[PDB]
Design a protein around this nucleic acid. Sequence first.
RNA 1: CCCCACUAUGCUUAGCCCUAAACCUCAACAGUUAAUCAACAAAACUGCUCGCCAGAACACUACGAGCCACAGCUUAAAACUCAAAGGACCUGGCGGUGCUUCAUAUCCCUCUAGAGGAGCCUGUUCUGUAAUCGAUAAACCCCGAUCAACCUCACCACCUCUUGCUCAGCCUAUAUACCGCCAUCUUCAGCAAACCCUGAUGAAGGCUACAAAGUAAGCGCAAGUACCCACGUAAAGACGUUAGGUCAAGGUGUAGCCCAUGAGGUGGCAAGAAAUGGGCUACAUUUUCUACCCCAGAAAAACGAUAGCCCUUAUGAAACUUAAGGGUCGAAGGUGGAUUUAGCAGUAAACUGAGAGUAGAGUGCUUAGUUGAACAGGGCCCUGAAGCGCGUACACACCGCCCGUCACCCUCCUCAGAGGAGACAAGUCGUAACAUGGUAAGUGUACUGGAAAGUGCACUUGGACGAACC
Lengths: 53, 23, 208, 303
Amino acid sequence: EFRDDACRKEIQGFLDCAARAQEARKMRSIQETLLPNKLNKLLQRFPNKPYLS
Amino acid sequence: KNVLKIRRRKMNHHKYRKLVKKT
Amino acid sequence: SRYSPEFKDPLIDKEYYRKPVEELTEEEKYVRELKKTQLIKAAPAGKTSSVFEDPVISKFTNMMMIGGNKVLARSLMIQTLEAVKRKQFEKYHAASAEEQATIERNPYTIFHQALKNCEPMIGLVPILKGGRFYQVPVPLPDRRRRFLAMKWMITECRDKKHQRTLMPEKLSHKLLEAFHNQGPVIKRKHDLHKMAEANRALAHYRWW
Amino acid sequence: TEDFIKKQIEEFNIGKRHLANMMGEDPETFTQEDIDRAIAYLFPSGLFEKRARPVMKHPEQIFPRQRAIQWGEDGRPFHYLFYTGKQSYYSLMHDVYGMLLNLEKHQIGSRWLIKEELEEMLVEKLSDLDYMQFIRLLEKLLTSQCGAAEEEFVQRFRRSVKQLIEPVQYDEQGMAFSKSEGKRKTAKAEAIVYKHGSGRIKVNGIDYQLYFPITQDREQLMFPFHFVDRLGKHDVTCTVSGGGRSAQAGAIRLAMAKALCSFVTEDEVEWMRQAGLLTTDPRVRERKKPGQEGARRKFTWKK
RNA sequence: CCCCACUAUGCUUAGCCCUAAACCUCAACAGUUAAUCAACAAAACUGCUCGCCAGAACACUACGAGCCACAGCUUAAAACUCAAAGGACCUGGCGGUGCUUCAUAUCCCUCUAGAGGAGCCUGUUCUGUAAUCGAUAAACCCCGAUCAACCUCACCACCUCUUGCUCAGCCUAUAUACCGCCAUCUUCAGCAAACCCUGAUGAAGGCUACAAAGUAAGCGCAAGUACCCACGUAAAGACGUUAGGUCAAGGUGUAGCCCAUGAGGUGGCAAGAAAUGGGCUACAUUUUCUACCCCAGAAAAACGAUAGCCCUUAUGAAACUUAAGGGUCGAAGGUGGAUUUAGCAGUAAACUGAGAGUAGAGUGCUUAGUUGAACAGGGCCCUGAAGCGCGUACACACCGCCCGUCACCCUCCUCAGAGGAGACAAGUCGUAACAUGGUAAGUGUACUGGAAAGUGCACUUGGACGAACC
Ligand SMILES: [K+]
Ligand SMILES: [Mg+2]
Ligand SMILES: [Mg+2]
Ligand SMILES: [Mg+2]
Ligand SMILES: [Mg+2]
Ligand SMILES: [Mg+2]
Ligand SMILES: [Mg+2]
Ligand SMILES: [Mg+2]
Ligand SMILES: [Mg+2]
Ligand SMILES: [Mg+2]
Ligand SMILES: [Mg+2]
Ligand SMILES: [Mg+2]
Ligand SMILES: [Mg+2]
Ligand SMILES: [Mg+2]
Ligand SMILES: [Mg+2]
Ligand SMILES: [Mg+2]
Ligand SMILES: [Mg+2]
Ligand SMILES: [Mg+2]
Ligand SMILES: [Mg+2]
Ligand SMILES: [Mg+2]
Ligand SMILES: [Mg+2]
Ligand SMILES: [Mg+2]
Ligand SMILES: [Mg+2]
Ligand SMILES: [Mg+2]
Ligand SMILES: [Mg+2]
Ligand SMILES: [Mg+2]
């Protein structure tokens, strides 16, 4: 009947898991930040030459 | 290329078939 | 903002500054030494070092304020606390010693526990998958939970059902009911939980 | 050109002598400060922009540094890196690289000059990325155990980068005190805090609990003394004018904190500053703007 | 289009039918890689042979002929019509366009106060009158007006004057001729002359920092400046977009009147059937009245008009029609539907003054001050932004282009009257094609349907699938 008093354990688990989800979002963002930018820099350094020179 | 010639031919053919059906 | 980005919000806490130097980790000592050369925002006129200061009650007063009437909001808050304490004292005196041990008389504790009971664990948010928004259930962060509890309390007190009943008495009665896990505010929390459970099937619509 | 600048310098010397004669001062000991004062007097300009005002300065300060012709009569440029178009910048880079090679073979006081400063030194126009490249190279030089022989060079590109306790005065009766002032919004407060007292605070000649019947304002008055654990140790006489009750309370709080700084230790003063008890709240009412309801409120948009 | 059922049909046998975007749109054979080559595509050619082509549309059509074909297939014209049609690209606009990153009072949720409900004030539309004009999507609507009783006034009715206040005059048309002053993106950062280079010396394009063709004066941004700091707010904000606003600030080109479209006098309208925008007051108990400017006492079904009616006063020559005060009345309403506005801090909200203008006059505008918050964290359907791309039949640039039916007329062809084509040419019903055109498009064929067309089967890319792993 939605009485949290006797659902305390499950509610605490849910809250802790949500906090862990936010923490995981933060850590994943910082970890994401080879990167496409660096790889494009490398490819620019060594470009494909489909023509003559 | 576009398909404007094909569309003109398609309309011609459709109208011809419709007329043949009619008459 | 008249404060440049280099300005930091002040840290008003006597114990923090009176902490012994030997008890400071290297990072804490670095933080103090850095703050020694940082501009600090002037202390706002709301919070002080007073030991009786309560951030939760201050925020409740601010939320209850209407049109910059801080004096009136504080008056209502103190009247509510006094009414709660008087009612608890009356119950304590009229009650037998067996239950006097459990009867609570601290209005601040009563208020904190009432808000905590009113806090909703899960809310409903519009989440969009494919171009349609649905009221998907979602956990509510701590700030949102506290804010929702306080706002529900204030709105329920402000309802027009209670006529000729002053806000002090209304809020004291509602706070006591919430402390005892009853009343319209807890009913609203349970309604939110019931709606979230009813829409439980849409949880996957969340992407975060 | 050089001849033009020389003629300008001669003109400036003659005019400086003339101005000294005009003002009656000694031509010999007439300095640039004296020239500026004399010109400001003789040609009073209220133009806000100082640069737009009359100026009689040395031609060196007036005219911009003109880059001299970079080749001789035969046409041959002077610097072997001339054709780079950035000969000075690339010469500097080349020298830094040579120093770095020699270093590699053998083995809160200043900052890095801005791109504008580097351009001024090199009499050349640089780019953000060129400046960043040069700064990275200089940082590598700094990290690479640069000795005196290298530090003497490096320092050419380095640019150098607490509450003011009031004096303690004494009244006629020999009691020590400190006087301070503080402004909040439109409220200005002058507060005198005595070294010894029973905690009495008399504002405008009235007891504080009467002047500030509002608990919030009394709490604001309490906040400084309570913070430094000096409640009941100091007497205060405050005079506050302007603003409302809350502005007056804040101004008095700032003035009291500043005055009490003279009686608390330096560590306590720094702690108060960190708690924000000595900062002048710059938040003041924002002017209303034409065509809108208030400072930020806009008129109801009518699509 | 999406879901379900089911038939012809897809399958076997024997015959027919003989068509495909039957396309690898690139003929067979032999040879070359040398001095390139309109564009794109799948590099440029040489020799030899056959087939085919000679502006578009009429026309995968009519007639003739052949055929197991009987609404068919192959071969295939002419008349009338037009100055074009077409192929490939470049720039831009656009995409119910892709990926990524975003919007910081901003696009959605989230926070606060509102509008949308009531009365009143005011503007506008409509109606009304003899009775202005202009703004009129964002970027109009307390806007020109920091203001209409007469005047203002440019309007209407009547009357009067004619070298007229003016070496005349006109508030007469043209803001789609303008100067002047501005709205708008702009809550942008780019506009750029003069050169250089690339593209075979086409329209056009010009970047990679471990750098690969750009250099750039000038304008803008920025900086500097005012207010209270170096923050914030002002101010500033180029080149251009909307033939955006103003001929009614004034001036002015063109055009128009001159016994009047000029000038003067008296009087007069400036209202509400009704709708709608903005604001003010409220619906109250965080409230109402009083004292005080915050330690009170009463009120509480009363709260609630700044409206209505009467009186008085202020200004004025003129006040039922302006303002203030008083009296009287105590009305609608009981926190407002989808929708929608503003706000990132001394801000929103609430409250109190002052000023411009007037003889007087706004709930309007400008401005000073006081009390003074809540959220500020997640995301990309709709709005939009930037970068990198993709598509393009649009170029008046999607408020585009455009297809077909039905009726609107002239020319030609076939024809017992009727059909077909083309043009002239404005409509009706759809929105089929062009963007992933909102179901990708199209070929062959079959059925079906006002109509563009839908669907089945196979085929084409003359679509894409975002091009390391995720
Ligand atoms: K409303
Ligand atoms: Mg046709
Ligand atoms: Mg095939
Ligand atoms: Mg065919
Ligand atoms: Mg045929
Ligand atoms: Mg035949
Ligand atoms: Mg907004
Ligand atoms: Mg209304
Ligand atoms: Mg009008
Ligand atoms: Mg008009
Ligand atoms: Mg008149
Ligand atoms: Mg009039
Ligand atoms: Mg006229
Ligand atoms: Mg215009
Ligand atoms: Mg501005
Ligand atoms: Mg600027
Ligand atoms: Mg126009
Ligand atoms: Mg116009
Ligand atoms: Mg006339
Ligand atoms: Mg009245
Ligand atoms: Mg009179
Ligand atoms: Mg009443
Ligand atoms: Mg369509
Ligand atoms: Mg389609
Ligand atoms: Mg198909
Ligand atoms: Mg069908």
